[PDB]
């Protein structure tokens, strides 16, 4: 009843947290590539 529903909700929260883990890994992967263009611009052709 209520206990089983709470367990299902917490399992959904665990799934959401794991999805957030994967999303944060991909977010680091994208963000490291992001903002590199300006650094290369000031570092490579400015030099």
């Amino acid at each position: 009843q209520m206990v089983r529903f709470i367990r299902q909700e917490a399992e959904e929260k665990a799934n959401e947290i794991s999805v957030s883990a994967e999303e944060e890994f991909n977010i680091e992967k994208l963000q490291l590539v992001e903002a590199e263009k300006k650094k290369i611009r000031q570092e490579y052709e400015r030099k």
């Binding site: 089983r4 929260k13 947290i17």
Partner: protein
Amino acid sequence: LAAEQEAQHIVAAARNAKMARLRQAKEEAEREIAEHRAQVER
């Protein structure tokens, strides 16, 4: 209760989120360096 076990799994996944973000940041630094190296080598 199953709720306690599911909450423990949720806490484990929450910790794994912080773990995976930090783990992926270092590896993605390599991708950023690779893009910079391609731009330089050109």
